């Protein structure tokens, strides 16, 4: 999915909130909140069509609350 999204953006079609949410649906279960947070930071400080929605916030929150170690109450 990441390779295809990179190729699609290379072809001239930029990723929107839909593709980013699709990517986040898998990153949120990796056990490392930093991957999902990097994707969220990419979305939040980007263009209008990449802006996060409720699903994006839910994915990042789920990634943070189900972390393997360290505390994440401040991040949430």
């Amino acid at each position: 999915a990441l390779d295809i999204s990179y190729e699609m953006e290379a072809a001239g079609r930029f990723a929107t909130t839909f593709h980013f949410n699709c990517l986040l649906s898998v990153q949120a279960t990796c056990g490392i909140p930093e991957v999902a947070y990097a994707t969220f930071e990419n979305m939040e400080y980007g263009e209008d069509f990449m802006k996060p929605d409720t699903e994006t916030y839910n994915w990042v929150i789920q990634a943070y609350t189900r972390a393997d170690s360290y505390d994440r109450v401040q991040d949430v």
Binding site: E9, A15, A38
Partner: protein, 585 residues
């Protein structure tokens, strides 16, 4: 745009004795370093070939020292505030006395039953505990249950840390903090200790760190190739540990602990222990910390290959993007490229023959050096690099002598003058580095200073005086004529400069120049001094610096500029520079 995500991390952490063994697996048991006669690594010693590897792996293979008694880590006990003291919730004095003096701790462990009313840290030895209890309880069983009600040294500390219930610590600290709050200097400091204790206990729960690792059971041994002072401290640990196991007494237990503390961190116990020369030892903390330590000297700055140095001399004939390199520096820096150039055109059989040819200074070596230096930039750098313009990239050319030729207009950025200054030269090797140097660091794209945006390569001193004298106009008024007054006319600027060349006029002699462009002469916004109106229609308007002829019959308009050869020369120089650059592209 999807960001090219890169998730790289590094984490420090307190190590476990099992991981120390995994590093070593390999235990150093003897304090011998090398054979006095055969100069061979002593077996089981600090340089043992079996433990560390054959005489690359000797730079990375670790060992360990099996301490008979556990020794506390100095960083976590003696550094202020003490982490062990805070986690155990006891004053530092009593812990230090337990570790350094002949003090025994009452009730060190809890998860096993006891039968005695011994609490606190009794400084004096218990008279009954010396004979009565051991003699009634014999020796084997008494020693079996000995280390459960009374203990001493770092072993008691490790036992206290191992059985600590962190969640109970957090709850007790929180409830005590609430009690203190619900009730003024150390009424707050006790609160601050409580807050510090729950935050310290919280971090242990979420990590894999164990608080008992703060007291060492094994001592990792640095690889030999990293210690070809530290070796002397390692012998002492073996010197006093091997003595201790021979006994198996309290004094030798303290001696081992002091050996480890000195090895780990000296200058922390007040008086730092010295060697036989009355010189303070250097510990691992000393070699990793400080301006001369590993972080600030070996990692933040490096010495590099393909670099040179020489004295700087001025070259006014150089271009703004060029520098002069000494022949020896150039042949040293570009040695591999000269070898490739020699081999490529079949003038060298192999690498050795090419190197021999270079060493003999053959006349054909310089042709290949000159060929390969074309298009390959270099980086110059003066010593006190105060801003980014302290290192710049130039196109090297071969100059005679032993000095580096530097452009005069780039000296201000380097803060360089030609009274003894020197510079370092670096050669970018890979294609990416060469592209970076050519497209980002050359002086012709770095004409502005990043601090505020002023130009940095502005003419200074001699050039400034030359321009000032050139553009200093005519002598005027009483400085031009002795008496109250009750000049050549040139068709074009070329005629005026030609007359100047033939010594017909001076540099500052006034002249009238026919102007065939728009009025573009900077002058005071003033009306004409005199208007000479003719009855035929033509009128002449005389200004301070030009004369304009107009007519009412026609639309003609003639302009004559009163100036000197210097102003014309400055204008022509800039105009010709622009036109030549435009034509050359």
């Amino acid at each position: 745009m999807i960001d090219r995500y890169k998730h790289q991390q590094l984490r420090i952490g307190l190590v476990s004795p099992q991981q120390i063994s995994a590093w070593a697996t390999g235990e150093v048991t003897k304090p011998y370093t090398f054979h006095y006669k055969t100069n061979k690594p002593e077996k089981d010693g600090l340089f043992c070939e079996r433990i560390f590897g054959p005489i690359r792996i000797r730079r990375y293979q670790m060992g360990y020292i099996k301490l008979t008694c556990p020794v506390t880590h100095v960083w976590y006990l003696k550094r202020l505030p003490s982490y062990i003291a805070n986690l155990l919730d006891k004053p530092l004095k009593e812990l230090e006395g337990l570790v350094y003096c002949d003090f025994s701790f009452a009730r060190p462990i809890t998860k096993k039953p006891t039968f005695l009313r011994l609490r606190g840290s009794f400084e004096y030895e218990i008279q009954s505990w010396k004979y009565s209890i051991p003699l009634f309880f014999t020796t084997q069983g008494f020693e079996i249950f000995r280390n459960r009600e009374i203990s001493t040294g770092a072993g008691a500390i490790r036992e206290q840390l191992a059985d600590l219930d962190l969640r109970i610590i957090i709850e007790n600290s929180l409830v005590e903090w609430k009690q203190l709050g619900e009730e003024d200097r150390k009424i707050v400091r006790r609160k601050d200790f409580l807050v510090r204790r729950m935050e310290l206990a919280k971090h242990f729960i979420r990590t894999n760190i164990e608080p008992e690792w703060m007291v060492l059971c094994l001592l990792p041994v640095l690889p030999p190739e990293l210690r070809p002072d530290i070796n002397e401290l390692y012998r002492r640990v073996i010197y006093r540990n091997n003595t201790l196991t021979d006994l198996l007494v309290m004094c030798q237990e303290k001696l081992v602990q002091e050996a480890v503390d000195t090895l780990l961190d000296n200058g922390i116990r007040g008086q730092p222990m010295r060697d036989g020369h009355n010189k303070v030892y250097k510990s691992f903390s000393d070699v990793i910390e400080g301006k001369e330590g590993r972080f600030r000297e070996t990692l933040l700055g490096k010495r590099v290959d393909y670099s040179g140095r020489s004295v700087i001399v001025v070259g006014p004939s150089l271009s703004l993007h060029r520098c002069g390199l000494p022949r020896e520096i150039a042949i040293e820096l570009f040695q591999t490229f000269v070898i490739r150039g020699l081999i490529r055109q079949h003038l060298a059989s192999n690498i050795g023959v090419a190197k021999s040819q270079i060493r003999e200074k053959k006349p054909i070596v310089w042709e290949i050096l000159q060929e390969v230096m074309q298009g390959h930039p270099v980086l110059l750098n003066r010593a006190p690099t105060l801003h980014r313009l302290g290192i710049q990239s130039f196109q090297p050319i071969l100059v005679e002598g032993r000095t580096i030729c530097l452009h005069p207009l780039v000296c201000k950025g380097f803060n360089a003058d030609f009274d003894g200054d020197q510079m370092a030269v670096h050669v970018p090797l890979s294609l990416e580095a060469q592209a970076e140097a050519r497209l980002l660091m050359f002086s012709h794209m770095n004409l502005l200073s990043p601090a505020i945006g002023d130009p940095i390569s502005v003419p200074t001193q001699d050039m400034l005086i030359g321009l000032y004298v050139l553009t200093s106009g005519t002598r005027r008024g009483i400085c031009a004529n002795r008496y109250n007054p009750c000049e050549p006319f040139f068709c074009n600027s070329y005629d005026a400069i030609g007359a100047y060349r033939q010594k017909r006029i001076n540099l500052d002699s006034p002249l009238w120049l026919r102007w065939q462009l728009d009025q573009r002469v900077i002058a005071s916004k003033e009306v004409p001094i005199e208007v000479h109106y003719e009855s035929f229609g033509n009128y002449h308007e005389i200004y301070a610096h030009y004369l304009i002829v107009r007519s009412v019959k026609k639309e003609t308009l003639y302009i004559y500029i009163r100036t000197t050869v210097g102003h014309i020369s400055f204008y022509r120089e800039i105009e010709e520079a622009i036109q030549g650059f435009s034509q050359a592209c």
